[PDB]
């Protein structure tokens, strides 16, 4: 004969379909052999299966009814497989079960109504499936349930108010379904609740005032729903809250001053709502705060000076509001600031000298405000700086020397400011700088001679600055693929060693005072696609070889003094406007035949 435990396990072997590796070793020889089988743990006395782990074995098919004979089972894990069909009711006959995890499968249809038979269930995880229809009210009867996860499916309807009566519930997760309606105030009755993750649904209305009774709640997330109205003031009474995510909703009004009572708060995210008024100065007392985010609201006024001395502050995001006044002059002094983005506001005054006090600042985004004054020399000693976007301000003076010394500096945009005098020569020597935009300033000076020797450096623009003199020789122009120098006062001739720029794709030298000829070496460039040399003084022919440059899609040389025939090949198929206002130029392409 054979033990029902063995037969019940073998039923599973033959009912579920996976690769041969899935159940290789579930082999019977020629007693209690099944206890050597992977995923199986037995009571050492009676030989019954008490734990069964079939997680991540690439299985599909259905659970066979015979599973009910594994009657002293405590733990069951089927997660990370391809199980399908409705949820198998025979699981409800495993009445000693404390832990049941079916997450990351494809179970579908409505959830069957028998789960209260599992009287002693502590943990239930069904995250990420295909369930639909109503959330089972039945789970209300599980008096020892501590952890409940029903997220990542397509459950619809409201949250059953009866879930409020799960007196020992610590963790609840219902995020990422199609739940709707109003959050039931009765959920505030969950005394021992510590984690509440229920966003990415369609909940409307406000957050129930009785949620302020969840004295043990450490984590709260209801982002990306349809909540609206004022933030609930009473959420100030939650003194254990570490994480508050309320972003991507439709809250309005002011931020309650009472949130200054959240003394253990670490992450605060109110991104993408419609909040207005000023950041409460009581935020200066949130000393545990690490991540402060208010992106994309209708906030205004001044940033309280005190947020510049929050000791733990790491991430500060205020972009896309309308704050006014200056940045708290001590911001950065905590030695801990890593990333800061306050773009698209109305900030005035100087950039604080202490932003990078502890070499942890790697991302500094300031663009589209009205910052003024000189660029702080301290940023040139910001050892960790990686991304610096400060375009569209009123920064004046000489750009300081020092940026060439920062090993991780890779993106710099200082365009559209009011900088003067020399461009820093050491920009040519910064080890990993890839993007550098200096367009729209007031230099009135030459390019640094060494500019094209920048090792990595792919995109360089200085269009419409006030550049003068001649373009330096293209010596080893190693990784450039986009060069923008339009709208300056560059004179002399295009350097004839331009062929060193093997990676070049777009080149804009238009609207200068360049003369002499078009350099022949442009023809030898492997990938060049865009060239614009219009509005200059160029003379000579367009080299015939250009007609076999297969990659060329744009070649605008209009408004010059070129002469001779337009080449034929690729050039046969180009816009005629590229060749206009050149009295001496000719060709079928442009309507003036040759000779």
């Amino acid at each position: 004969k054979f033990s029902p435990q063995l037969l019940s396990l073998l039923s599973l072997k033959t009912s579920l379909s996976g690769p041969p590796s899935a159940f290789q070793d579930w082999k019977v020889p020629v007693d209690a052999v099944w206890c050597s089988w992977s995923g199986v743990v037995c009571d050492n006395v009676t030989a019954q299966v008490i734990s069964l782990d079939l997680s991540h074995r690439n299985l599909s098919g259905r659970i066979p009814i015979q599973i009910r004979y594994l009657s002293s089972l405590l733990y069951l894990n089927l997660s990370g497989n391809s199980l399908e069909g409705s949820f198998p009711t025979s699981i409800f006959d495993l009445t000693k079960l404390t832990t049941l995890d079916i997450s990351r499968n494809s179970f579908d249809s409505s959830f069957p109504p028998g789960i209260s038979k599992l009287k002693f269930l502590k943990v239930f995880n069904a995250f990420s499936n295909n369930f639909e229809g109503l959330l089972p009210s039945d789970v209300s009867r599980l008096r020892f349930l501590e952890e409940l996860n029903f997220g990542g499916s397509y459950f619809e309807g409201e949250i059953p108010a009866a879930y409020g009566g799960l007196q020992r519930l610590k963790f609840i997760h219902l995020a990422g379904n199609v739940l709707g309606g109003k959050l039931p105030p009765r959920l505030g009755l969950l005394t021992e609740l510590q984690h509440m993750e229920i966003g990415y649904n369609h909940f409307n209305g406000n957050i129930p005032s009785e949620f302020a009774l969840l004295s043990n709640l450490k984590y709260f997330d209801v982002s990306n729903c349809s909540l609206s109205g004022s933030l609930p003031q009473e959420l100030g009474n939650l003194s254990n809250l570490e994480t508050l995510f309320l972003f991507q909703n439709g809250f309005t009004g002011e931020i309650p001053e009472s949130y200054s009572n959240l003394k253990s708060l670490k992450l605060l995210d109110f991104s993408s709502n419609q909040l207005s008024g000023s950041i409460p100065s009581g935020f200066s007392t949130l000393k545990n705060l690490t991540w402060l985010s208010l992106i994309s609201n209708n906030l205004s006024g001044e940033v309280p000076e005190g947020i510049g001395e929050l000791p733990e502050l790491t991430t500060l995001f205020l972009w896309n509001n309308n704050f006014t006044g200056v940045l708290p002059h001590k911001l950065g002094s905590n030695g801990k600031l890593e990333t800061m983005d306050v773009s698209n506001n109305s900030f005035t005054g100087t950039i604080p000298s202490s932003l990078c006090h502890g070499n942890k600042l790697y991302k500094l985004i300031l663009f589209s405000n009205m910052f003024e004054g000189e660029l702080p020399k301290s940023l040139t000693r910001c050892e960790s700086l990686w991304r610096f976007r400060s375009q569209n301000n009123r920064l004046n003076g000489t750009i300081p020397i020092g940026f060439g010394s920062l090993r991780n500096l890779t993106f710099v945009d200082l365009s559209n400011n009011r900088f003067t005098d020399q461009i820093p020569a050491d920009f040519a020597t910064a080890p990993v700088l890839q993007y550098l935009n200096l367009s729209t300033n007031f230099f009135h000076r030459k390019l640094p001679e060494n500019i094209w020797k920048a090792p990595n450096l792919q995109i360089f623009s200085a269009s419409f600055s006030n550049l003068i003199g001649e373009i330096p020789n293209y010596v080893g122009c190693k990784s450039f693929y986009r060069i923008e120098l339009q709208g300056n006062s560059l004179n002399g001739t295009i350097p004839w060693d331009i062929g060193h720029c093997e990676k070049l794709l777009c080149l804009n030298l238009s609207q200068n005072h360049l003369n002499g000829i078009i350099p022949w070496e442009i023809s030898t460039l492997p990938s060049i696609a865009d060239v614009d040399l219009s509005h200059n003084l160029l003379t000579g022919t367009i080299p015939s070889d250009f007609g076999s440059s297969k990659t060329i899609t744009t070649f605008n040389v209009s408004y010059n003094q070129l002469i001779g025939p337009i080449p034929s090949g690729s050039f046969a198929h180009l816009n005629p406007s590229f060749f206009s206002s050149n009295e001496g130029l000719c060709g079928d392409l442009v309507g003036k035949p040759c000779n």
Binding site: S128, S153, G176, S271
Partner: peptide, 12 residues
């Protein structure tokens, strides 16, 4: 199906 967690990831 997967479900976002954590703070809003948007960035410049």
């Amino acid at each position: 199906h997967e479900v976002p967690s954590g703070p809003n990831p948007i960035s410049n």
